[PDB]
Design a protein around this nucleic acid. Structure first.
Length: 797
DNA sequence: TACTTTGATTTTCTGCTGCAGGATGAAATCCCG
DNA sequence: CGGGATTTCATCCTGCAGCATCCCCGA
RNA sequence: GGCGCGUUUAUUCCAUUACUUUGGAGCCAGUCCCAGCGACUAUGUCGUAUGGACGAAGCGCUUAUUUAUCGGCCGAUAAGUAAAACGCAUCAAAGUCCUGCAGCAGAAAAUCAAA
């Protein structure tokens, strides 16, 4: 039976546990606040429940609304002030937000600059550069660059990033002292958020400490993006000037009137970017009108300019959810998660937020087993690792409190609240922080979008598994296709197939197919879509997201099934070394057909939450795996058409060509998607070649300049090459016949085994002297695979 | 002097994904009763 | 003499190799 | 296209806690109440859906309440019929969030050029 939780239980039961590092895996719970609509929904069931919870009181709702409005206004005001400050002088803010080194890097500085990279704007003094060289754990030498000022107050070690001329490299949200400037009343800054916006009603500590992060994170992100994008602008300008010089020279060579417009110097604001893009667009329009259109010049010989893209805008000011933030869960920030003991295995959950002046949420430590009825309890986590159970007492009718009852399901509760293993009572799970989200949700009863209150609570796992004993031996190759989502094959370390799966007939085998019946489903959906489109020119809202939802369902289920098979079979998964975002980008393609990276990421995240690295069960490997027969190892190539076009000599019966000593009969018909006609036109290959040969003598290939060679190659690129049937596969050596997907799945695992063989090592050693080639790789492939077929990989007869 | 595709400027709308900042308590001083 | 409420502060390492794996077409 | 019931995703144990989705199953998709096309003399349709306006949306079983029907409610079945409770249709999976930026697309509209 296939459940992810059963797999997780199997993993936990099969391995030991250890304490997590400095920061462990983190997971988030998103639930909803018990509102009156949920109360009515619970009251309208056929079988009414015995005890319906009370909804959130009016006072809590009013206080929450007031707090949300004030928080949003404060964030806007601070962001506006820092936007103005950045506009006045970018360099000052850039140096101020720079994240200093930890106050423990006290290794003896050895070498200064061989100096004016930046400057400490606090004292307006140059920030002299100092060097520090060290060697990492793997032996690669690394040089650390630091900036130090002569001022005792500014005796810091700001990080610097060398460039081939220096950059900062880091922008932290705590580098700038936000609290002492805008929060405390001792400062004389003209802009004070809490004193002016909140009307002296909000507690300084928690609200200020929340605003600090809420603003500095955005400012740091914006500054990092700005700093990164400036260098790419320099590179683009450098690569663009030469190209425009070449284009101007070409235009002068044709004797046309080139416009007298010159590039502006590199800008640093959005208006300069706009002007530069306008000039580039004008130049490209002129080039299009004069060179490619009238004279028909190719793109490579006359290539356009490139626009300036990626310049960021200041957060939230250079122009909806309302967010109330909680910095942390400790007695200092005036927030708590309270649960009522009734029995040694039951809880009753609430969450209290006291952000107002004139509230009472006093704690007091209790004995480990001093629990009493009608009294609330909670736990507090320390840096030292100790857990102190403390009880919370307060007044339910407090006019300054915020009381939130939560609503969730059994799955979420078993995952976080009352989990069997990760029980937060003993400290195995720690509550990190939380948020309050106010967003619009669809109400089906009223058929309107209405505001709803959500609660997000992030939990950090403190005990993880030990990967020192997870050593899979067997292998599983996954071959993906469009007709079938996935076909897999199970092999032992030696590579021999393992007959442990069961087919429909129950016979032993080593092949399974996952997610079948898909193709007819999306084809029915597309048939309905096309019928509606032909009927009325458009489809209803139903067919907007059916394919996407079904594809997401299928990829999730396939990932779950392969995870189950790998875990229960003691095998390590192998995927194809496809670059991220790989897929077919054509005419009738859909974005719902790209589930390679999505699957890898889902599997990686699921393995990561348990504390194991991806290399324990998940891997990648290599190119030329689907085009290889399992009898001798012959492989066809797209570049192998050069062999076809090498002779192309003519006989009395027509054209003839040979590849690898095998005669090829030149005949066949070609049907291609003619975009000029938006239809399919069928042409005869021999007839096309004869029409080409009408204007040629002796039909010699070497007499071809550029064009007729390309047209003949495009004609010949179908012929008799590798594919009588798309799904069926036949081997050229002895006529071996087998399904293509199964062979591809087996060959992917065998390729992964190959990339760690000794032939590959000697290949790389020859690469050390320099042997970058293409034919040698395929030759080693064929030789190794033939040897392995000879020794251990007995073929099926 | 019939009536397709391509390359291109701008205008709007619907979506969908990548990538930075993240996931804070310990302790030292005022104010006060 | 506690008991809150407000202010300062400081916490982090170095990933290998294929010509294309659905991207090459005639005009 | 819409309208509602909801079960399973922990092994003897841990909230039919109730949230957000996916898949399956269940029911209604009609009314002439109007304006279209065949061709039109071009603010006026004989047959025909190109659009508009209203309405629609489980079945059983156990418990009083208006009549028929004869023995003078002791006779049950038909509707209106309160609430409790059960059964069937009807069954299985998943969830890591916030902020700010940009980048990818898809579809329409105003202008230059071509065999």
């Amino acid at each position: 039976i296939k459940r992810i939780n059963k797999i997780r239980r199997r993993l936990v039961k099969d391995s030991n546990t250890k304490k997590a590092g400095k920061t462990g895996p983190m997971k988030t719970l998103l639930v909803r606040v018990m509102t009156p609509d949920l109360r009515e929904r619970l009251e309208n069931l056929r079988k009414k429940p015995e005890n319906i919870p009370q909804p959130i009181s009016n006072t809590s709702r009013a206080n929450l609304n007031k707090l949300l409005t004030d928080y949003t206004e404060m964030k806007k005001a601070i962001l506006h002030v820092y936007w103005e400050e950045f506009q006045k002088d970018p360099v000052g803010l850039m140096s101020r937000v720079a994240q200093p080194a930890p106050k423990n890097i006290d290794q003896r500085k050895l070498i200064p600059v061989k100096s004016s990279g930046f400057a400490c704007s606090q004292c307006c003094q140059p920030l002299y550069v100092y060097k520090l060289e060290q060697v990492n754990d793997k032996g690669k030498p690394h040089t650390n660059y630091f900036g130090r000022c002569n001022v005792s107050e500014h005796e810091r070690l700001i990080l610097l990033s060398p460039h081939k001329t220096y950059s900062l490299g880091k922008f932290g949200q705590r580098a700038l002292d936000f609290y002492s400037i805008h929060v405390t009343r001792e400062s004389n800054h003209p802009v004070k958020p809490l004193e002016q916006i909140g009307g002296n009603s909000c507690a300084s500590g928690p609200v200020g400490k929340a605003l600090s992060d809420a603003c500095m994170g955005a400012v740091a992100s914006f500054l990092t993006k700005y700093q990164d994008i400036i260098l790419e602008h320099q590179k683009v300008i450098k690569k663009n000037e030469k190209r425009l010089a070449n284009l101007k020279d070409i235009a002068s060579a044709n004797g046309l009137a080139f416009p007298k417009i010159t590039l502006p110097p590199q800008p640093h604001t959005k208006e300069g970017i706009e002007a530069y893009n306008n000039v580039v667009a004008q130049i490209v329009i002129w080039v299009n009108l004069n060179l490619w259109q009238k004279l028909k010049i190719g793109r490579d010989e006359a290539k356009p300019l490139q626009r300036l893209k990626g310049f960021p805008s200041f957060p939230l000011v250079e122009r909806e959810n309302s967010i109330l933030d909680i910095s942390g869960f400790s007695k200092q920030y005036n927030c708590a998660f309270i649960w009522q003991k009734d029995g040694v295995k039951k809880l009753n959950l609430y969450l209290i937020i006291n952000y107002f002046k004139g509230g009472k949420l006093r704690f007091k430590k209790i004995k480990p087993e001093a629990f009493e009825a009608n009294r609330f309890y909670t736990v507090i986590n320390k840096k030292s690792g100790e857990i102190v159970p403390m009880e919370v007492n307060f007044n339910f009718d407090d006019p300054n409190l915020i009381i939130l009852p939560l609503a969730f399901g059994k799955r979420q509760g078993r995952e976080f609240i009352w989990n069997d293993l990760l029980s937060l009572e003993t400290g195995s799970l720690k509550l990190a922080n939380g948020r309050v989200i106010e967003k619009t949700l669809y109400n089906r009863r009223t058929r309107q979008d209405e505001p709803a209150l959500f609660v997000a609570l992030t939990f950090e796992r403190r005990e993880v598994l030990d990967s020192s004993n997870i050593k899979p031996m067997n292998l599983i190759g996954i071959a993906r296709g469009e007709n079938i989502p996935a076909v897999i094959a199970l092999t032992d370390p030696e590579g021999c197939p393992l007959s442990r799966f069961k087919d429909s007939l129950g016979n032993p085998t080593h092949i399974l197919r996952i997610g079948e019946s898909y193709k007819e489903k999306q084809r029915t959906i597309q048939a309905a879509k096309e019928v509606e489109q032909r009927r009325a020119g458009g489809y209803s809202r139903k067919y907007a997201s059916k394919a996407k939802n079904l594809a997401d369902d299928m990829v999730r289920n396939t990932a779950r099934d392969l995870l189950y098979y790998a875990v229960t079979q003691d095998a390590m998964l192998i995927f194809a070394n496809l670059s991220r975002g790989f897929g077919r980008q054509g005419k009738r393609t859909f974005m719902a057909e790209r589930q390679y990276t999505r699957m890898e990421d889902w599997l990686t995240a699921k393995l990561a939450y348990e504390g194991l690295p991806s290399k324990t069960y998940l891997s990648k490997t290599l190119q030329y795996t689907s085009k290889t027969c399992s009898n001798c190892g012959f492989t066809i190539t797209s570049a192998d058409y050069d062999r076809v076009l090498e002779k192309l000599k003519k006989t009395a019966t027509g054209w003839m060509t040979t590849i690898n000593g095998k005669e090829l009969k030149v005949e066949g018909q070609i049907t291609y998607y003619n975009r000029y006609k938006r239809q399919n036109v069928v042409k005869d290959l021999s007839v096309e070649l004869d029409r080409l040969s009408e204007e040629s003598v002796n039909n010699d290939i070497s007499s071809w300049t550029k064009g007729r060679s390309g047209e003949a190659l495009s004609l010949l690129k179908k012929r008799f090459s590798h594919r009588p049937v798309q799904e069926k596969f036949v081997c050229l050596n002895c006529g071996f016949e087998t399904h293509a997907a199964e062979q591809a799945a087996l060959n992917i695992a065998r390729s992964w085994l190959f990339l760690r063989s000794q032939e590959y090592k000697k290949y790389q050693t020859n690469k050390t002297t320099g042997n970058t080639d293409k034919r040698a790789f395929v030759e080693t492939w064929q030789s190794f695979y033939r040897k392995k077929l000879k020794e251990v990989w007995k073929p099926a007869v």
